[PDB]
Write a protein that binds this ligand. Sequence first.
Ligand code: DWD
Length: 369
Amino acid sequence: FVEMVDNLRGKSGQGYYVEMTVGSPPQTLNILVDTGSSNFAVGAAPHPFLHRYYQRQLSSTYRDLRKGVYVPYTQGKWEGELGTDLVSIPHGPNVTVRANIAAITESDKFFINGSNWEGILGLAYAEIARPDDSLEPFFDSLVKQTHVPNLFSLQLCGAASVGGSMIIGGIDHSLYTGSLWYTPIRREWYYEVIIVRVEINGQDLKMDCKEYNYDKSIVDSGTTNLRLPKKVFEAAVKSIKAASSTEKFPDGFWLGEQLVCWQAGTTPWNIFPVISLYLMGEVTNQSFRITILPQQYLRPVDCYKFAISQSSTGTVMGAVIMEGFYVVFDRARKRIGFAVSACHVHDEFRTAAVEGPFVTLDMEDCGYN
Ligand SMILES: CC(C)COc1ccc2c(c1)[C@]1(COC(N)=N1)c1cc(-c3cncnc3)ccc1O2
């Protein structure tokens, strides 16, 4: 899998992208890697923000599905024309598949001014594909048409340029240390999981665990922050406020509405607590925990942004979580694996951790229905 190592690039806060080719002859595009959606959609018109775009008129293998698709989402929208074409991944497996491609023809707040990507690769399941679940997501097409095993894994490395690895069809042991610990994929739509317990500096938040997953918890490479349900965010901030009493901060800061600054080099990591999420384990009454540092949740913009935010769509384990870990999207076995990332950023005192097993009762009650 060495050829796939370091196949991800990006700029801080603008997502991680992978190089792809579409059409014959192949057209090279950079594509945002998104485990939080399920469409393969590429710019197909000369939007001023785009370095390049899909030109269907140059492709002999293009097939028109003669159908439109309309996709608003919480932070923008895109609209496009459905088709199929030959798609490959230069720094992925040595294969070419015929996949659905939405040719983006109108969008709002979708493309980023200054970014180096031109499209989005939705790695989640058909249930949330647009316009409906009969539009086969790319990864399903890949697995159906080749011998590529039904899993992929992500090592997101963070820092400005960011880098990482998407290992398609397997797992690269050089990207992590210790053991992988697996949590069940609750349902195949988003990559949905169940959080059974939350600690701040080893101190249990002591909330009904249903709150942690109201109305869902997902693993999402297409979200920057750790996003937490409102009630849980509130409780987490109160505890983090308390744990970091050494200094005082404005209420806007905890809402991600203004930065806070330290004279360069004297940033006090130590006054900031670690955060632990316990995830439902593979066995009845068994869990494991993942632990991140302030290096993960205080984002550099020396100034810093608080990168934990409140949510009305449930818990979202975005880049803030994923950058601590090597994450295995084991589709074949309906589970997601976490191990300590070989690239994660740590000091000489504390370190991101994946630890188990723990005894946790009533974990089935933590899921929302
Ligand atoms: C299945 C439905 C409900 C959600 O569907 C969508 C559709 C489009 C869509 C995105 C999601 C989004 C927003 O969050 C995620 N995961 N992808 C998304 C995220 C980014 C993004 C990611 N990271 C950093 N900056 C921007 C850019 C575009 C973008 O577009």
